[PDB]
Design a protein around this ligand. Structure first.
Ligand SMILES: [Zn+2]
Lengths: 147, 20
């Protein structure tokens, strides 16, 4: 499942880099590198322009431990519950994932960041694989925003 | 509530990049 592997590598690297402040590639490295750079520009913009909403959403989720981190899967599924899929929703979910990741670092729950990245990746790849393939994967992601 | 609020924000982001 290369689409899962590539997606996890991009999403995990972004969440962990956002949480730790320290920038840390396999197959399709050139595309994945542009996707991660696109994610830095667009995702940092999303978190800044919607910071107040994200703060309230984070407080509502009330994440105090690793057990509270097993509820986000149902939240991520809710993003696409109306049947609509687009890159804006996808990048917004990953940006909010990075926002949670920063929170998890602050409360010394850094070990939860990887299961969070695996859960975001699973929802995208498991429930939207057809759409992601039709949109040409992360090449299409990079092209859609064309920063 | 949270996933719906993310969907709304994401649609605004999508419109911003998609509009011709
Ligand atoms: Zn609801």
């Amino acid at each position: 499942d290369e689409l899962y592997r590539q997606s996890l590598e991009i999403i995990s690297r972004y969440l962990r880099e956002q949480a730790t402040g320290a920038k840390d590639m396999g197959r399709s490295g050139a595309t994945s590198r542009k996707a991660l750079e696109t994610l830095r520009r667009v995702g940092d913009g999303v978190q800044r322009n919607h910071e107040t909403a994200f703060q309230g959403m984070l407080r509502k989720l009330d994440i105090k431990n690793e057990d509270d981190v097993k509820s986000l899967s149902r939240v991520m599924i809710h993003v696409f519950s109306d049947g609509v899929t687009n890159w804006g929703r996808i990048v917004t979910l990953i940006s909010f994932g990075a926002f949670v990741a920063k929170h998890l670092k602050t409360i010394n729950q850094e070990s939860c960041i990887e299961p969070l990245a695996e859960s975001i990746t699973d929802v995208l790849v498991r429930t939207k694989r057809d759409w992601l393939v039709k949109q040409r994967g992360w090449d299409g992601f990079v092209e859609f925003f064309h920063v | 509530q949270v996933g719906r609020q993310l969907a709304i924000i994401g649609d605004d982001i999508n419109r911003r990049y998609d509009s011709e």
